[PDB]
């Protein structure tokens, strides 16, 4: 699992659940193609996104769809998303957790990489 | 001034400066057409990127090359730039403030809408 | 002015208004003596909580009084109140403006020091 | 283990080790006695504070010394430290994870709240 996503809710201080978060890879053609997605767990986090093999070096983007997470609870929030664009394992094999802490009209991500 | 962009750097304390900003809109084709660039001042701040009259309701894009602005003081950052996309809903007079403030690992964004 | 406090909601992405703000100077005997206090404006800001001959170097403790903002809005929130404390150094013309963005279990504070 | 503190280092992306953590409780008389301390692991995380017993209801301050943290690394933090004062149990038992991301002039904490 080199690839983990953890989301928090800032508001309700609790993990953000069901959260959707789309994945994409930087083709050859400068374009974004479909690379995994998947939805936030209990504890707001997403496992099993993919694995070391598939996960070769390149420009991914982690799409984390924060709209429709807000709008279920009744709140309209500013972003349409969240995004994080990275380039990945350009030194080798990495371990990549992006965390998101989100709020209506804030969010904030960080990245802890592992060797 | 509807739009306005504030950067800030969290490692020196300071505002970010000279980091390109390039804001996109939607087009009709789904497709992010070119709307407005700049880059920040000394005050870390971007001002008369647009118009009332230019800044019609739309998604838009606000991408902050944050990359090129670590390089360029010896540190390697994570992201490739910073992104906030956005609904202009333009009900009533209301001015956008993005402001972002960057770590090398991390970086985060809010909005003001006054 | 060399020290200005903003606070910002990060829930309705506004000004954080008419926050109570004390300001505290760390006394010889380890004690947090008054310093100033004030409520943010409708920008969010505080200003002349202080001039450049009264701030002089020491450890100061900034309390944003959090928790009654909330309140006031129906919102339980989970700190009691936000403290920022840092020394001031004093070592050529700086200003020191302490930013807080605001949510109900969550905060975020950062200095900018021109 | 009610009272969990996890620390994150936003410049090296990678958790804030050996961080020193004091928590205090507001005292009767409106003083703060030593509650419990103790250091973030290999993983930036410090578990075994105290236990749901002794975790009675009250006002809990949490201060992470940060100023040292950034100091062993070679950079002048602004802040001395970074405090996190909150109620806590008022109704009933939570379990609490008090997260802090640090930059040497800007920190951000977020509590998540189980039941
Ligand atoms: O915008 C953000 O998310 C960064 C941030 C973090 C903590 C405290 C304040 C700020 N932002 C900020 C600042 Cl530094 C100045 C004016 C308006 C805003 Cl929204």
Not at 3 to 8: A, G, I, Y
Not at 10 to 35: L, Y
Not at 84 to 112: E, K, Q
């Amino acid at each position: 699992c080199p690839l983990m996503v953890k989301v928090l809710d800032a508001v309700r201080g609790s993990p953000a659940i069901n959260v959707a978060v789309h994945v994409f890879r930087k083709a050859a053609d400068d374009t974004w193609e479909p690379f995994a997605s998947g939805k936030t767990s209990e504890s707001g986090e997403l496992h099993g996104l993919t694995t070391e093999e598939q996960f070769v070096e390149g420009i991914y983007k982690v799409e984390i769809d924060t709209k429709s997470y807000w709008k279920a609870l009744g709140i309209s929030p500013f972003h349409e998303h969240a995004e994080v664009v990275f380039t990945a394992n350009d030194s080798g094999p990495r371990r990549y957790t992006i965390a998101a802490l989100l709020s209506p009209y804030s969010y904030s991500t960080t990245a802890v990489v592992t060797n």
